[PDB]
Amino acid sequence: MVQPSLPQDDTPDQQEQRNRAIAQQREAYQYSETAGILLIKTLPQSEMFSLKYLIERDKGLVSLIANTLASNIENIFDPFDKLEDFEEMFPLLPKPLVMNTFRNDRVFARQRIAGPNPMVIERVVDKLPDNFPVTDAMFQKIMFTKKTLAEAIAQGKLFITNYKGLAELSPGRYEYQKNGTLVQKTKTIAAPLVLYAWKPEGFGDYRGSLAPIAIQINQQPDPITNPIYTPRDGKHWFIAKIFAQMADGNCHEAISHLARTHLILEPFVLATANELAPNHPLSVLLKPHFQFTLAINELAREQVISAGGYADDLLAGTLEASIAVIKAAIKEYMDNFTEFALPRELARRGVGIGDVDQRGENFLPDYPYRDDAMLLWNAIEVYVRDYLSLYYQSPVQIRQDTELQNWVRRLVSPEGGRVTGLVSNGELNTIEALVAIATQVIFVSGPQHAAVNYPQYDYMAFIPNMPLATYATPPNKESNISEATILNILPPQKLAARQLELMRTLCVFYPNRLGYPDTEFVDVRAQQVLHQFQERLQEIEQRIVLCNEKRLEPYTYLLPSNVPNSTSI
Amino acid sequence: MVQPSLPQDDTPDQQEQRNRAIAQQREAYQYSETAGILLIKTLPQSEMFSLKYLIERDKGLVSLIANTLASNIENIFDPFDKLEDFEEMFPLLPKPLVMNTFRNDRVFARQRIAGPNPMVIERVVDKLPDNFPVTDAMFQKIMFTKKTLAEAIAQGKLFITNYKGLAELSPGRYEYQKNGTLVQKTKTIAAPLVLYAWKPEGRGSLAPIAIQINQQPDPITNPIYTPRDGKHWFIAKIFAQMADGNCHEAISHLARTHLILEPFVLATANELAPNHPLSVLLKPHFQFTLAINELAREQVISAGGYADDLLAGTLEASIAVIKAAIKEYMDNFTEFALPRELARRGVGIGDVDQRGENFLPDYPYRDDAMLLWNAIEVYVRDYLSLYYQSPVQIRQDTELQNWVRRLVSPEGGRVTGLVSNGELNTIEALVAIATQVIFVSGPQHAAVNYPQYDYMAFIPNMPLATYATPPNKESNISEATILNILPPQKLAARQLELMRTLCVFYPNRLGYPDTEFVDVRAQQVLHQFQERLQEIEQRIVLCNEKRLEPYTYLLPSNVPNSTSI
Ligand SMILES: [Fe+3]
Ligand SMILES: [Fe+3]
C-alpha cells in the first residue's frame, strides 16, 4: 500500500526499487507473437483468472452440456431438416431476442445501429460507389417516391454498409466422413454492398427508422450473376439479407471484436507492465481495466485463432485469411490510433453528433450505440482528467516522467505494438494528450468491448439471423427458392451448434463491473475521483433507462451495470 | 532463490523476515468450514490453477459437449429403453475398459483389488459376521467342494466386503415436472455384505461367493444371493457395486485424499516460512490442491452438486459419511500408512500362510503402491537428512512445532493421531509423516481417481445410486426391472460427465516439480527419486505382462505430483 508518485519525485533508493520491480515485471511479461499478433510469452500466475471467474465460466460450459443433452441437433455436417429446427436449439437456454422478428426488414436494418457490430454503417456523400449501380428506378420503386438518388444523397438520407474488406478472402474448407469416404467442401464468400435509407415517416407512425433499400451480394456488378436485390425480390431478398448478415458477422468477429477490442489492448497491458512501476499513477489507473485481459487473449490464442479453433470452423474464410483481416484491422487502428477515438470515428463515418442537417438534427437520429457510447466516453474522460491532474499539474512533469516516456517509446516501437499514431512530434509532451490516450484505452476495454461482445448471443446465437459462414452460392435471380435451398445456404447442424456454443460462453456472465475495481486506491484523493465516476455512472444509467422507454427497442448493452471494467470475456 | 534453513539457525533479522512472511501467509490462507469440513476462506491467486490446467480442463468439457451432441441420450428422468443403450453413450469418448466384461464374476471381484476402490476387502478371521448367515451348504454348492466355511476361514481363503458404513444413510430424493405435475421419487439404499473366496485353481483369482444386499438378514425380504440365482445374482452385484461406488466417492476419494490433505496445506502456509525445508519439500505435492478442493466445495458437495444428484443418500447423509471418514483418518493418522492399513485388513505383505505365500497373491494396488511408498520414504528420508542432523533440531525447530500444534488443534485439522507424547521429537517420525502426506497426494489419489472412467463411466458396472428396490427372490426379472434399478438417462449422463472430467488429463507428474530446489544436494535427492521411479516403472510393466489384466494406474508416469483433479 504505497502512495503513487512520479519517478522523478522519488529518492534515489526509491528509484532503485522502482527499477528493480520494473526489471522483474519485464522478466515476467515478455513479448511474443502468434501469426504476427503480439501476445505474451508466458502468462504470470497473478494474471490468471480468479476462482470466481472459473466458477462462472464452468457454469456456462455445463449449461451448454445440459442444453445439448435436451436438444435434437446432431453431430453431423448435414443441413437441418426444417427451418423451424433452428428455433428448437435453446431448450435449456435463453431464447435469442432476435429470433421472432429477424425476418423483418426494420429488424435487419436496426442491427446496423444497435446490433453486435454497430461500426460499419456510413452516410453516403456525393455518390454511391461506381461498382454499386443502383438506379433512380430502383430507389423510386422501393421507396414509393418520385425523389432521385441524387436528391436523397443531397439530403443526407442514404446510408451504406460496404463490405469490400472481405472481398479478397480465400473461402474456408471443411471435410468429413460419409459412407466410408472423405467429402471435402468449400464455404461461399460474399462481400456485399447494402444501401439503406432513413425514413422519417417510418413504417406507419411518427417513429423514424432505418429501412434497407438494396443489396448487391458481391463487389463486381453483373446483371445476371450478381444483380442488385431489393425488398421486391421476395425469397431472393431474404437470401440476400442472409449473406449481408454473414458479412456483418465476419467483420464483427475479425475486425470489431477480436482485432479492435481484445488484440489492440494487449500492447498497452504489456507496455504498462514493462515500463511503469507498481506505484506509478498511470499503471494504478489502467490496471483495473486490464483484469483478465492477458488471460482471455491467451484463451483466444489457444481456442479461437488456432487451427481447429472457433474462427477456423465458423468464419467465412480460411484461418489464414481471417488472421490477415484481423492483422490489417489491428494495423489500421494502431496507425491512426487517435483517429479511432469514438467522436472522431463516428464523424469519419458521417454519423457523429455533429453530422446534422440545416434544421440542426442528426441525419441518423436513431443510433443507440452512438448516444450511450458518447455518455460513457465523456464520463470516462472526466474521470481520467480528474485522476491524472492529481499527479500531473504542469506538462513538464509529463516530459520529465522517464517511465511514461519509455511507455510511449515501447508502444510506438515495432516490437511493442507499433502504435505509430499515438503521439505527435514523436514524443508525449502534454497532459491533455495522455488524458485522451487513457480515455480511449479505458473506453475500449470496457464500453466498446461490452457493446460488441454482449449482443452476440441475442443476434448471433440464433443462426439464421447471422451465420458466420454461408455454405452454398447465391441462387440465380430467376431460380425458384425452396426451403432446402435456404437450408443448404445456412450452416450445417454441427457448425450451428458450434456457433451457439461460442456465443453462449462469450455472453454468460460479467467478470467485473465498470468503475468498481477489486482493490481501491491507496490515495484518498484518487478514491474520491473514483466515487464521483460511480455517481456519474448512476446518472448515465438512469438517463439510458429513460431513453429505452421511448426507443423502438431497448438498448441495454451500454447500461453501466452491464459494462465490464475490462475486456475479460 | 534463498537457501533453505531451519528457523533457529538464522540471524535475528532473518528470523523477523520469516515471521513477516508467515504472518502475511496467515492472513492469505485463512481457515474456514463448509458443513463442518475444513477449507480455505479465500483462495490466494498464487494457488489458482495455471493457464495450462485451464486449457486442458476446457478441452475435456468441450469433449463432453461434443460427445453429448453425438449421443441419443435425452434430458429426462425416464430409464433407458434398452440395456444396450448404456453402451452407446461414448460416440466421441474412449470406451470404458470394463464395458465388455462387466457381467463376468471374475471382473466383478477383481475390482476389489484393482478397481477404483481397492480399500474395502478384508480377510475373514475366526468367523463371518453373525448378521451374514452363510451356511456350509451354500459355500459347498458354490465352490463345488466338500470343505466347510470353518475350514476355509482357517486356511485364510475367504474375504469379505462389509458395507455397514452405508446402513444409516437417508435415501436421496429427486423430483421433476411431467405433464404439469411434480413427480417426486426416492433412491434405494443398500449396505451389502459380499463374501469372496480365493480360488487357486481358476491363474488363481478371487471369486464372489455370496451377496446379502442389506445388513439385517431375512430369508424372504433380504436373502443371501449366490451365483446360482441367475438374474437375481446379477442384480445383487449391481447393488454391491453401487455400495462400492458410494464408499469410493465419499470415503476413499473425497474424504481420504482431497479433504484430509487440506489441513496439511493450510498448516504449511500458516506455520512454515517459504525457505523452510519442509515447506519446500511438500509444496510441490500441494499444487492445485486448494483450488481443486474449492471446486469440490462449489460443484461436488454443494446443493444440486454431483454428490447430491448422483450418490445414494441425501447430501446431508453423504456429508455425514465424509466427515466420519475424515475424523477416523485423522484420529488414527499413523495407522493409515499404507503398510499398516493393509495389515489391518489382513491383506498386507506379511499376511502369509505357512508356505510364506500371501493369502491374497493377486493385489496389484498393494504391490505397486508398496513400491511407490518405499520409494517416497527413501526420498524424504534422504531429503530431511540434509537439514535435520540430530533430533534436537527437530525439537528446537519452532516453525515445525507450531506446524504440528496447528495440525492437532481442533480448529486446524484435529489430527490427534499425528504425533506421540503430544510433541514431535524424532526425525523418523517426521519422515513417516511427510512420506504419508506425499503418498496420499500422489499415488493414493491416482489409484482412487483414475480408474473412475474405466469402471464408473459405464453406468451399469457401478451406478452411484439405485432407483428401485431389490426384486423379490422368487419374482420374474425382465429387462425393464433392471432398467428401473439403474439410473435414469439424465443422471447416467451426469455420472459420465463427472468421471470424464475427473480423468481427462494429468495436471503434473510425480517427482517432477515446476521449480527445482535451490539446494544442489536437494536436487540430487530428487534426481535419485526420479531414477528410482524409472526403475519402478519398468518393474510394473514387467508385472503387467504377467498379470491377468494390466494395472496401469500406479505406473509412475501416470501418477500426478499432487492431488489436483
Ligand atoms: Fe470478447
Ligand atoms: Fe480427485
Residue numbers in the entry:
A (entry chain A): 1 to 569
B (entry chain B): 1 to 202, 207 to 569
Could you give the paper's own sentences about this structure?
Lipoxygenases (LOX) are key enzymes in the initial step of lipid-mediator biosynthesis. They catalyze a regio- and stereo specific dioxygenation of polyunsaturated fatty acids to yield fatty acid hydroperoxides, which can be further metabolized to a variety of signaling molecules with diverse biological functions. CspLOX2 is the LOX with the highest relative amount of bis-allylic product reported so far, hence it is a suitable candidate to study the molecular basis of the dioxygen positioning at the bis-allylic position. We demonstrate the importance of an active site clamp around the pentadiene system, which fixes the pentadiene during the reaction resulting in 11-HPODE formation.
A key residue that is located opposite of the iron ion and hence likely restricts the space in the kink region is the highly conserved Leu304. Exchange of this residue for a less bulky valine reduced the relative amount of 11-HPODE to 30% compared to 74% produced by CspLOX2 wt (wild type). In case of 13-HPODE, Leu304 and Leu502 are rather facing the side of 13S-HPODE formation, while Leu506 faces the side for 13R-HPODE formation. Consequently, if more space is created by decreasing the size of one amino acid, dioxygenation at the nearest position on the linoleic acid substrate is preferred over other possible dioxygenation sites. We found that the ability to produce 11-HPODE was diminished by widening the active site clamp in CspLOX2, while the production of 11-HPODE could be induced in its isoenzyme CspLOX1 by reducing the space in the channel.
